Design a binder for this molecule. Structure first.
Ligand SMILES: Nc1ncnc2c1ncn2[C@@H]1O[C@H](COP(=O)(O)OP(=O)(O)OP(=O)(O)O)[C@@H](O)[C@H]1O
Ligand SMILES: O=C([O-])C(=O)[O-]
Ligand SMILES: [Mg+2]
Length: 532
């Protein structure tokens, strides 16, 4: 277990874990590679070697998060501050848990990990020492340890020297809860959090995303309370120091579009915004691999090598991967340490204040324009709305473009965001990476061209006009982009086709925003939304 930094069995005994004979502290990438490739492994622990040099694993019955199994202990520390599922007006997954049931779940996990060979990985959540969390991850599955090593900030030998955990996550994926029915829970699985004890317990599900998004939820709780923005976005910097953030729901393009060879990548999913600027919470990127194209996305493709971890992909007998196959799941992914991307911010993932705020959305209705410059009020309206539809039309409204990870009320996030934007004189833009009248998704080539026009200032100097109903300012023409697609009405046989669909989508926005009108501030924002 590494050098002068290891843990004693007496220390694990304090967490409630007993009889641990073999401890693997701070595992190296080489050891992880050996553990995963052990030919005697059976089941979901087993990994396979691909022709690209990266190991591939299957995450079990769960290939994505399970929000129905997410619980937060309601006590005197979280009672008056948490955005509870049974008290507010907005729908959320922050279901309350009694301290007594928590104790029951903690016993299940500690017993499951007792008498086992354990992996212990210490890491940081947050690039800044003043607001970061020192997290200790405990697991009995090698690839899960690999996932946290990739996704979180890897400490230096000196940092490990005086490492003191302020948050502990015990992954007991192999165990389940037989008393769930009598405890009023959703199922035998569970993803629980206790802010008094500062711990996260996982049971039944092997999916690594629970640990990643679980800690994101905790940052989303602590930071805003300190006046710091906690955002679900990707980010990069230009040579001039111009920072751009990209908000959006899953599959909208945060990871694909931020990985721009012309710009230095800061992060791809979770960032904070304080008095000094934007900073990454993580130490790696988590890319989607369905229908992955080497030609269209070379940087992400080249990141798939030894130390990267493929998930639920289909591998053929000859070691080759079939990226197009989504039989196991459409949520095929690969995690990798951030340095697998050549052009990144080093040695610390952070930069100055963002001046360009981009909201990405995949509109399956084919109504919204490819690009539009938003007003201050429209920015707040769309942020709270958090729109997207379908994949590859069913609407989805997720506040702040990430409601599933919010620990506080949505307006609290909007407040701090506006605060930071006004101070930096930031400008907002709405980008539709989705569909139009053709019934096909806009090309990644055209989308990248649009992003370039935003960053280089072409869009800010372009001649614009107003799109009816949504009242969005759209450019008459844009360098490197096809003029015909800029106006969504042009993609249909007749502008009346767009009209019918536009009215349908407009009504969906109006109905959804109705829950924010219970305050004078939210009532004033309705004027910023679409109007028949
Ligand atoms: N025009 C387009 N713009 C962006 N992505 C596109 C476009 N056309 C197809 N895609 C595909 O859509 C997906 C976008 O995924 P990406 O990983 O960027 O989503 P994300 O917003 O980062 O999701 P998550 O929040 O789950 O991490 C990729 O598979 C990408 O190849
Ligand atoms: O599971 C998720 O949504 C993730 O981590 O991207
Ligand atoms: Mg992503």
């Amino acid at each position: 277990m590494r050098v002068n930094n290891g843990l004693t069995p007496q220390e694990l005994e304090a967490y409630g874990i007993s009889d641990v004979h073999d401890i693997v502290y701070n595992p190296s990438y080489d050891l992880l590679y050996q553990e995963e490739l052990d030919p005697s492994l059976t089941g979901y622990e087993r990994g396979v070697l691909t022709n690209l040099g990266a190991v591939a694993v299957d995450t079990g019955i769960f290939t994505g998060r399970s929000p129905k199994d997410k619980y937060i202990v309601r006590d005197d520390t979280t009672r008056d501050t948490f955005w509870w599922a049974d008290k507010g007006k907005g729908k959320n997954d922050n279901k309350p848990l009694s301290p007594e049931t928590w104790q029951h779940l903690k016993g299940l996990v500690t017993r499951q990990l007792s008498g086992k060979r354990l992996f212990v990985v210490d890491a940081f959540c947050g690039a800044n020492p003043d607001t970061r969390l020192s997290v200790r991850f405990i697991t009995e599955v090698a690839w899960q340890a690999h996932f946290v090593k990739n996704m979180f900030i890897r400490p230096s030998d000196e940092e490990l020297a005086g490492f003191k955990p302020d948050f502990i996550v015990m992954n007991g994926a192999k165990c389940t809860n037989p008393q769930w029915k009598e405890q009023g829970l959703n199922s035998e699985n569970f993803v629980a959090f206790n802010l008094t004890e500062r711990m996260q317990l996982i049971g039944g599900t092997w999916y690594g995303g629970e640990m990643k998004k679980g800690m994101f939820s905790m940052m989303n709780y602590l930071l805003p309370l300190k006046g710091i923005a906690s955002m679900h976005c990707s980010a990069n910097v230009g040579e001039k120091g111009d920072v751009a953030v990209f908000f959006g729901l899953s599959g909208t393009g945060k990871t694909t579009l931020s990985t721009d060879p012309k710009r230095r990548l800061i992060g791809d999913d979770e960032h904070g915004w304080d008095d000094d600027g934007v900073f990454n919470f993580e130490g790696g990127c988590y890319a989607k691999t369905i229908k992955l194209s080497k030609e269209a996305e070379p940087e992400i493709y080249n990141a798939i090598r030894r130390d990267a971890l493929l998930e639920n992909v289909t591998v053929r007998e000859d070691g080759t991967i079939d990226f197009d196959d989504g039989s196991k799941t459409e949520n095929t992914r690969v995690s990798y340490p951030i340095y697998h991307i050549d052009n990144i911010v080093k040695p610390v993932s952070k930069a100055g204040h963002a001046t360009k705020v981009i909201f990405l959305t995949a509109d399956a209705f084919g109504v919204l324009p490819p690009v539009s410059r938003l007003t201050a009020d429209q920015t707040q309206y769309h942020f709270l709305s958090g729109f997207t539809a379908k994949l590859a039309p069913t609407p989805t409204f997720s506040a702040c473009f990430g409601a599933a990870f919010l620990s506080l009320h949505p307006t609290q996030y909007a407040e701090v965001l506006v605060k930071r934007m006004q101070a930096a004189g930031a400008q907002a833009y709405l980008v539709n990476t989705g569909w139009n009248g053709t019934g096909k998704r806009i090309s990644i080539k055209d989308t990248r061209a649009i992003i370039d026009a935003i960053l280089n200032g072409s869009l800010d100097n372009a001649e614009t006009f107003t799109l009816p109903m949504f009242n969005l300012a759209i450019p008459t023409e844009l360098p490197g982009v096809d003029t015909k697609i800029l106006d969504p009405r042009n993609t249909y046989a007749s502008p009346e086709q767009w009209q019918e669909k536009a009215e349908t989508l407009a009504k969906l926005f109006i109905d959804n925003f109705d829950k924010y009108t219970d305050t004078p501030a939210g009532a004033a924002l309705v004027a910023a939304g679409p109007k028949l």
